[PDB]
């Protein structure tokens, strides 16, 4: 129930990444969510390897590397694999490569993941407050999304059908405009230092609360 949350202020969010020509936003959404749970448990902030997911969380998990994927099955791959490599050791190349997972460089683990009910922006607010950053999809197929520079994003022709993976690391209000605080993966030059504030409590705007999920690392 805090009116604003920003998980960057708790040291739980790594640097904004740059996906480039590879459609791996699902992998960035996944590692970003797990990175925060990693920080909470261990005190260490370490970027996790999106490339590991692109190359290894593939056909068994319904994913297609640079041609798309699910965050939930990415999570499941980490559970099945008993690990995910650090980004430093397995860095992002923005292309489809052979799986090169090496347990020697394991930087995190995943115990479970939770999916939130469709459209429930109230449940999403609670989870971001009481659990941490939440992986979500948004409908990003709008020039205005690409052109966004600052403020609370509102797109009248936006739909609830998601197509782009992002990370909800907070929420709040700017002079009564409620927004979601969203980490994108288009580098630092997009939006507000790589972030976009998207309208909140506007009937699941851009589908932000259509398919939320978040992972956990248990004791
Ligand atoms: O995660 C889940 C759970 C499902 C339920 C179980 N099945 C079974 C599956 C089949 C066998 C192998 C593994 C298990 C997969 C995960 N969702 C449930 C429904 C759902 C989700 C999304 C969703 C969520 C986030 C994003 C983001 F953020 F990336 F943009 C996108 S963009 C499209 C991603 N998509 C991934 C596969 C292919 F690359 C084509 C591209 C879509 N859309 N939809 C509706 C259409 C699909 O029903 C999230």
UniProtKB/Swiss-Prot annotation:
GO CC annotation, single: endolysosome lumen
Gene Ontology BP annotations: adaptive immune response; antigen processing and presentation; antigen processing and presentation of exogenous peptide antigen via MHC class II; antigen processing and presentation of peptide antigen; basement membrane disassembly; cellular response to thyroid hormone stimulus; collagen catabolic process; extracellular matrix disassembly
Keywords noted in UniProt: Cytoplasmic vesicle, Disulfide bond, Glycoprotein, Hydrolase, Lysosome, Protease, Secreted, Signal, Thiol protease, Zymogen
UniProt-annotated location(s): Lysosome; Secreted; Cytoplasmic vesicle, Phagosome
The keyword Disulfide bond belongs to this UniProt entry's keyword annotation: yes
Top EC class, one word: hydrolase
Disulphide bridges: 12-110, 22-66, 56-99, 158-206
GO MF annotation list: collagen binding; cysteine-type endopeptidase activity; cysteine-type peptidase activity; fibronectin binding; laminin binding; proteoglycan binding; serine-type endopeptidase activity
Catalytic reaction annotation: Similar to cathepsin L, but with much less activity on Z-Phe-Arg-|-NHMec, and more activity on the Z-Val-Val-Arg-|-Xaa compound
Coiled-coil residues: none
Main localisation: other
Active-site residue numbers: 25, 164, 184
EC numbers on record: 3.4.22.27
Family membership: Belongs to the peptidase C1 family.
Record text on subunit structure and interactions: Monomer.
Function: Thiol protease. Key protease responsible for the removal of the invariant chain from MHC class II molecules and MHC class II antigen presentation. The bond-specificity of this proteinase is in part similar to the specificities of cathepsin L.
Designated name of the protein: Cathepsin S
UniProt organism field: Homo sapiens (Human)
Gene from which the chain derives: CTSS
